[PDB]
Amino acid sequence: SFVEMVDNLRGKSGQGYYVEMTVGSPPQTLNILVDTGSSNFAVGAAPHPFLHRYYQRQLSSTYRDLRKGVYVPYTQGKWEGELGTDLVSIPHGPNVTVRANIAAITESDKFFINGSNWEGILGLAYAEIARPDDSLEPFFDSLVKQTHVPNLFSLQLCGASVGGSMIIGGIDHSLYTGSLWYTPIRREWYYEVIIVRVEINGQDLKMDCKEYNYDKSIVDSGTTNLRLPKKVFEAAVKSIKAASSTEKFPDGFWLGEQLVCWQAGTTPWNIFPVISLYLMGEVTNQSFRITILPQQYLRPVEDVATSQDDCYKFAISQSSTGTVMGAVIMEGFYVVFDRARKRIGFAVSACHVHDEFRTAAVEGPFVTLDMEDCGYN
Numbered sequence: 001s002f003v004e005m006v007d008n009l010r011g012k013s014g015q016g017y018y019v020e021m022t023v024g025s026p027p028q029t030l031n032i033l034v035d036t037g038s039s040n041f042a043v044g045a046a047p048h049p050f051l052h053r054y055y056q057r058q059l060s061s062t063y064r065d066l067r068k069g070v071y072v073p074y075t076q077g078k079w080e081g082e083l084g085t086d087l088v089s090i091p092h093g094p095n096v097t098v099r100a101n102i103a104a105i106t107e108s109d110k111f112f113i114n115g116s117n118w119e120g121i122l123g124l125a126y127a128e129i130a131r132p133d134d135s136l137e138p139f140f141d142s143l144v145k146q147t148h149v150p151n152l153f154s155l156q157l158c159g160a161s162v163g164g165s166m167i168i169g170g171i172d173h174s175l176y177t178g179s180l181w182y183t184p185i186r187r188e189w190y191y192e193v194i195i196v197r198v199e200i201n202g203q204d205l206k207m208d209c210k211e212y213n214y215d216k217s218i219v220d221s222g223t224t225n226l227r228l229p230k231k232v233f234e235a236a237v238k239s240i241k242a243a244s245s246t247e248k249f250p251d252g253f254w255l256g257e258q259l260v261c262w263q264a265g266t267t268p269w270n271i272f273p274v275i276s277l278y279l280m281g282e283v284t285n286q287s288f289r290i291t292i293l294p295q296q297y298l299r300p301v302e303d304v305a306t307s308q309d310d311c312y313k314f315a316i317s318q319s320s321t322g323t324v325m326g327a328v329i330m331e332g333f334y335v336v337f338d339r340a341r342k343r344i345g346f347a348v349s350a351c352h353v354h355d356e357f358r359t360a361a362v363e364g365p366f367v368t369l370d371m372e373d374c375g376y377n
């Protein structure tokens with residue numbers, strides 16, 4: 001029954017992907033950011049300059065007050081609100097209604113985005129990282145417990161003004177080609193995975209693989225960039241600079257500050273390298289790799305002038321909280337969050353990225369010794 005959920009995601013570039021939801025009785029419609037990097041379901045519940053609508057608990061006859069406050073910080077942005085419960089449905093999801101924990105957002109700082117068209121956030125990770133503590137059941141746990149929806153979902157995020165699919169409860173095989181390759185979920189808090197090798201244009205970065213996972217690696221649809229620990233970021237940028245040294249870029253470009261522009265249709269994709277991330281596989285000493293094209297980590301942005309030139313921002317940034325495989329990494333792959341079997345699957349998406357001579361790819365099997373030493377403790 002998955003055809004009805006195809007294309008149920010929208011968004012603006014670099015502003016997150018959202019799904020339509022309803023809360024309360026009568027149903028109030030809201031666009032909800034899909035975030036696999038957090039575990040709280042929360043909605044704007046008071047006026048805000050950037051909110052065009054918001055949840056009005058007083059208009060819902062099924063609302064229940066939990067009489068408990070909550071604060072949630074993210075990498076960028078934070079909010080505090082009031083906990084309660086209400087009935088929740090997904091118009092272009094499964095045909096069910098669940099009573100779910102909802103945080104009613106009453107104050108926020110740099111959380112809502114001017115012109116993003118979403119008014120809340122759906123944290124899809126596990127209760128261990130829910131606020132204020134792991135006793136606040138996340139939405140997807142509630143959905144699985146109260147209905148017959150199988151315990152998995154998949155995400156097909158498509159680039160450019162953006163759209164995609166969140167298939168709730170299953171895998172839609174018309175949305176990807178080739179084989180699905182699975183990596184274990186190391187621990188059920190974030191969707192934590194283990195990166196065992198990194199290559200740039202086929203050249204091993206030759207770092208202790210622990211550095212790739214310092215202090216964790218996660219899959220996070222709510223983060224735009226590929227985010228890398230300091231040491232990995234520095235070696236990657238050095239390698240990308242060297243491969244593209246044909247041209248010169250402002251130093252702020254490599255920090256994500258300044259953007260780079262070329263005359264329309266002349267972007268020199270060939271001087272930027274592919275990046276291969278090797279992930280721990282399902283059998284002993286076995287891994288697989290996903291290959292990222294520069295069309296993914298050079299994110300297109302609107303020309304800051306009155307020109308018709310293609311402009312891009314560098315969508316790889318430095319992290320202090322581990323590797324984050326954000327939306328630019330997920331774009332062009334079909335990603336299966338198989339919570340029932342504690343694994344994440346990757347395949348080439350049907351909305352894959354087109355280069356004239358290179359192709360994003362998921363490839364295996366590879367042999368990799370001592371993969372367990374790559375996890376940080």
Ligand SMILES: CCCCNC(=O)[C@@H](NC(=O)[C@H](C)C[C@H](O)[C@@H]1CSC/C=C/CSC[C@H](NC(=O)OC(C)(C)C)C(=O)N[C@@H](C)C(=O)N1)C(C)C
Nearest residue numbers: 014015016035037038073074075076129220222223224225
């Ligand atoms: C200070 C962090 C404290 C720890 N908090 C967490 O780990 C929380 N989870 C998280 O923070 C997640 C890891 C991230 C989460 O998805 C949050 C969701 S905030 C709502 C996101 C909406 C979509 S816009 C994406 C944005 N793009 C962006 O900034 O673009 C430029 C870089 C080009 C300017 C971005 O990337 N945001 C990152 C930074 C981020 O904050 N993501 C919860 C578990 C409590």
